[PDB]
């Protein structure tokens, strides 16, 4: 009876997503990788409406050389749409994962970019 | 003549609801006295170390339902 990881992910998210949310002055962004690609989708949960989005499967950034530079660029590219609106205090929801490796690189790129987390 | 073994008890605490649904309360008002969490905190509601529920703003109280059986109390701002 071998188990799968994303059910545990969803449990972790539901379980430590209890005290964290956005308020349209303090938005939150989360993160999600499965095995080859990276997603990210910011939301203000009072309204549950999507604002910005940044993906490693997107056309304009389609490269294979490293799995770290894609996290770096997807970060520094959501920062573009951020410094157009809503570039003050935001929260970085870590989905259901540790803080190690790709998630760290994404947070670093999103951080030294013009944001407040 | 005889010997009665029983005869003990403690002082009753005055637990339960303290404010009424629909009633305007003040900031830092005690809405429910309880051992435990028979009713959970909600929006602009806190809990103290005695498991005491209390308000955090000046509004109106509503008792509501949390999940499938769990219950909660909230305070909503505009009077």
């Amino acid at each position: 009876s071998k188990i799968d990881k994303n059910k545990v992910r969803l449990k972790r998210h539901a379980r430590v997503r209890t005290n964290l949310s956005g308020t349209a002055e303090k938005p939150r962004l989360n993160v999600y990788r499965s095995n080859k690609h990276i997603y990210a989708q910011i939301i203000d949960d009072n309204k549950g409406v999507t604002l910005a989005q940044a993906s490693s499967k997107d056309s304009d950034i389609a490269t294979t050389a490293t799995k770290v530079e894609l996290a770096t660029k997807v970060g520094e590219a959501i920062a573009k749409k951020a410094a157009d609106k809503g570039i003050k205090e935001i929260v970085f929801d870590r989905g259901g994962y540790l803080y190690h490796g790709r998630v760290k690189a994404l947070a670093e790129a999103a951080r030294e970019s013009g944001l407040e987390f | 003549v005889s010997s009665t073994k029983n005869g003990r008890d403690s002082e009753s605490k005055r637990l339960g609801a303290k404010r009424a649904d629909g009633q305007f309360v003040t900031g830092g008002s005690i809405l429910y006295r309880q051992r435990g969490t028979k009713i959970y905190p909600g929006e602009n509601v806190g809990r103290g170390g005695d498991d005491t529920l209390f308000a955090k703003i000046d509004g109106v109280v509503k008792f509501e339902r949390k999940g499938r059986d769990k219950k909660q109390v909230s305070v909503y701002a505009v009077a």
Partner: protein, 137 residues
């Protein structure tokens, strides 16, 4: 001589006798029975005597299903002593029967033979009886 092996508390309140049989009042394990029409406290001793009467009558041809058990204990107090020194000590076990409850139930005998065997035990027992059959219709 029927009584619980062990009971949680020992000095329990005195049950009710107003209302009607909450349940258990249809003969569904034999073929002929007998059921009460007033309320009373049928005790260990008189259940004992009433089954004595019926096993002593059928000479172990049939059988009796005792649909009553003395679950509750009652107490008494030393012989006519003064009031107010705690509750007294246990004295017997009882079972409250309301109008309707099937008290005794026999099977595997002549309908006649039951018709008098259940008549005999009615006298030993402090509740007025009535003889019934397996239900149809």
């Amino acid at each position: 001589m029927l009584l619980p092996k062990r009971v949680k508390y020992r000095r329990q309140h005195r049950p009710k006798t107003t209302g009607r049989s909450k349940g258990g009042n249809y003969v569904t394990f034999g073929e002929f029975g007998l059921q009460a029409t007033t309320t009373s406290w049928i005790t260990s001793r008189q259940i004992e005597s009433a089954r004595i009467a019926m096993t002593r009558y059928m000479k172990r041809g049939g059988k009796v299903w005792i649909k009553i058990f003395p679950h509750t204990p009652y107490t008494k107090k030393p012989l006519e002593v003064r009031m107010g020194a705690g509750k007294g000590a246990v004295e017997g076990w009882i079972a409250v029967v309301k109008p309707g409850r099937i008290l005794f139930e026999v099977a595997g005998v002549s309908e006649e033979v039951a018709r008098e065997a259940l008549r005999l035990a009615s006298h030993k027992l402090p509740v007025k009886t009535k003889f019934v059959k397996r239900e149809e219709l």
